[PDB]
Amino acid sequence: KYDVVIIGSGPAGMTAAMYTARSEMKTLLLERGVPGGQMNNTAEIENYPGYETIMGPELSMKMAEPLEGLGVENAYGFVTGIEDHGDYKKIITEDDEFITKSIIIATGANHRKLEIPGEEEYGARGVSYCAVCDGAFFRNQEILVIGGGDSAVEEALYLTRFGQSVTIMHRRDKLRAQEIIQQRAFKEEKINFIWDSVPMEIKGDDKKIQSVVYKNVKTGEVTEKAFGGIFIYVGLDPVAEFVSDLGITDEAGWIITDDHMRTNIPGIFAVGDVRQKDFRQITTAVGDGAQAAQEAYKFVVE
Amino acid sequence: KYDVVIIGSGPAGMTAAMYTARSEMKTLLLERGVPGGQMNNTAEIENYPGYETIMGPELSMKMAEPLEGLGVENAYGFVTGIEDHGDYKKIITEDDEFITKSIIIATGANHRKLEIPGEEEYGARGVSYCAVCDGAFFRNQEILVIGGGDSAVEEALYLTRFGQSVTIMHRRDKLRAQEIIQQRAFKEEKINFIWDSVPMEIKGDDKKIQSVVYKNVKTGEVTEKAFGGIFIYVGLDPVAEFVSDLGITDEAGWIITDDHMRTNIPGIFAVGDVRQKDFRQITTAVGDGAQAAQEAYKFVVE
Ligand SMILES: Cc1cc2nc3c(=O)[nH]c(=O)nc-3n(C[C@H](O)[C@H](O)[C@H](O)COP(=O)(O)OP(=O)(O)OC[C@H]3O[C@@H](n4cnc5c(N)ncnc54)[C@H](O)[C@@H]3O)c2cc1C
Ligand SMILES: Cc1cc2nc3c(=O)[nH]c(=O)nc-3n(C[C@H](O)[C@H](O)[C@H](O)COP(=O)(O)OP(=O)(O)OC[C@H]3O[C@@H](n4cnc5c(N)ncnc54)[C@H](O)[C@@H]3O)c2cc1C
């Protein structure tokens, strides 16, 4: 049936579908939630070339709008599995099955949340999950980072280029980050640490964050401190449950591809945040989605 | 002096500069011409996610406009050389020199022109140099492709998915393209050939192309035929004369990088159309630029 099925309608998948459909490939775009993916949980985006500033859901609409006129068949699907039959592959959703010559997996990643009062309320008003994205908004402020792995500590060091101070709050008494990243953190004076502690409530006014209430997990001692921003790194997971058995993922479950977005399965490509890679952004998601589209064309051709 | 100098203000270099500046790297963007690069010679762009349609020069302006407010220093420079000195590199322009810790080369490519009457007049009114970019505009039309290499013939093949027919006109009596590509052309019935011929004039009305006059280079014999669009592939060159002696280029002079945009010289990255790669688009230029900015940041930190 399909020349190509794209799983996931975030920026990578919409870019790939735009391409494949424009190139007259019979194109299906599957989505279990809402077009735009993680962009839908974003306020101001200032690093997508072409818009000085644009809101996440605005950009989601902009990217989705042309797809139907270009021929993309949009369809609801919560993809649970994929079978390769050589000449074709089968995609299994909760109520359906699709046959296709090629597959572009574009199902993204999930940023684990704190799930404390205030987190949602102040999302893009002080709460963030990405320093490259948002760090710039907090020049000379007191910045709080939550987490103790490579990500928390690396983004903390990055954020010391903006904040007056960066504080790392971790639930244990030492860090899980690599030694070299740790060494950098201990040498940087603008960083300090709050150990054995977890946040309880993110507080502020109607407009922006003003403080964080936190608790020492060993002692029970509760404390409130002023902070102007909170960056959260309590885990980042691939969203690729439906490929777990296919042999195309790494330890943590990221999809391995070559520079051409090809997985080790012929006709199966992956793009965007779901890939094993080190820079997760709209721009790199778009770049990936265009590349995979060209490769899927080529594959379907030969 | 600088943390990073981006050479070239096309989409790849503008995205890179935007990223480095936002990350507080002391950032210079050098450009000999007009910001936007090849986007300035483009009419409608329909495959840059975020815009259903936008004019090349309009996109250029949207991408250039934020750069100064983010801290990019724009400066005029026709770059002629680069010296690596280990800790720093020197960039030589016709009338100046700059010192920098790192360099992102973003100098693009040049599509060679026919230089015949009508080529400019019907640029984006039937004259094109990129089938993935423009083919969609010629469904069911008589399409003419100029050139005899891998690019002409692969784009011709691609274009048969829109046009009623596709004629390849080559100046010699047989093709330079790979045998496999040639076999595919020969087997595709919507392709035919005009040999030992070159175009002389592209003609039409005030809006669009209606015909092409051409000449048999052996016989002198002239012909006019009706065509609705013309796609030109008489050569594509890197624009990177200022690196020719640095050991970072391939046979044809494309800059070789890894998947992180790294050249074999530390602190020297390259992005976008100038790179050796297979898919030249704004999307992939933007993806490249973002990635290199993040690599430059990392290079400059350690
Ligand atoms: C709060 C926040 C702010 C951000 N700000 C910025 C910024 O300012 N600039 C920037 O460049 N980047 C930003 N990012 C990063 C950017 O949003 C991501 O890099 C980008 O969205 C990745 O796109 P994607 O297409 O790979 O995946 P995603 O956008 O995650 O979308 C994947 C899609 O796949 C769908 N899907 C998943 N599994 C299935 C399944 N089994 N079946 C069907 N559908 C499925 C999901 O619902 C989803 O819609 C931000 C991220 C967050 C969380
Ligand atoms: C007619 C046409 C139509 C196109 N249509 C589309 C489309 O619809 N969609 C799409 O995705 N892509 C399209 N493309 C391709 C797209 O324009 C390119 O992929 C993109 O512009 C390349 O980005 P870049 O930043 O790598 O280089 P470029 O855009 O080439 O920019 C390089 C810049 O570097 C500057 N420079 C070069 N040398 C030096 C030097 N020595 N010193 C200082 N500055 C220097 C140049 O002045 C130039 O401004 C089109 C291209 C053309 C020619």
Residue numbers in the entry:
A (entry chain B), B (entry chain A): 5 to 306
Per the authors:
The LlTrxR structures were obtained mainly in the FR conformation, which was unexpected since all available structures of LMW TrxR from other organisms are in the FO conformation, except for the engineered complex between EcTrxR and EcTrx6. LlTrxR crystallized in the FO conformation only under reducing conditions in the presence of DTT. Superposition of LlTrxR Cα-atoms with the structure of EcTrxR36, gives RMSD of 0.426 Å and 1.137 Å for the enzymes in FR and FO conformation, respectively. The relative orientation of the structures thus matches perfectly with the E. coli enzyme and consolidates the catalytic model proposed by Waksman et al. (1994) where the NADPH domain rotates 66° relative to the FAD domain in order to switch between the FO and FR conformations in the catalytic cycle. In the FO conformation, Tyr237 is distant from the flavin-binding site and another tyrosine (Tyr133) is in proximity to the isoalloxazine ring (4.9 Å from C7α), but no indications of oxidation of Tyr133 were observed in the irradiated structures of LlTrxR. The re-face of the isoalloxazine ring in the FO conformation is occupied by the Cys134-Cys137 disulfide while in the FR conformation it is surrounded by hydrophilic residues (Asp154, Glu158, Ser155 and Gln285). In the space between the β-carbon of Met43 and the isoalloxazine ring (7.2–7.4 Å distance to N10 and N5) a well-defined electron density appears, assigned to a water molecule perfectly centered above the central ring of the isoalloxazine. This water molecule is present in all structures listed in Table 1.
The recycling of Trx is catalysed by the homodimeric flavoprotein thioredoxin reductase (TrxR) that utilizes electrons from NADPH which are shuttled through a tightly bound FAD co-enzyme and a redox active dithiol motif. Lactococcus lactis, an industrially important LAB model bacterium, contains a TrxR that recycles two Trx (TrxA and TrxD) as well as NrdH, a glutaredoxin-like protein providing electrons to ribonucleotide reductase class Ib13. The overall structure of LlTrxR is similar to other low molecular weight (LMW) TrxRs317 with a dimeric organization in which each monomer is composed of NADPH and FAD binding domains. While investigating the biochemical properties of L. lactis TrxR (LlTrxR) we discovered that the enzyme is susceptible to photo-inactivation by visible light in an oxygen-dependent manner.
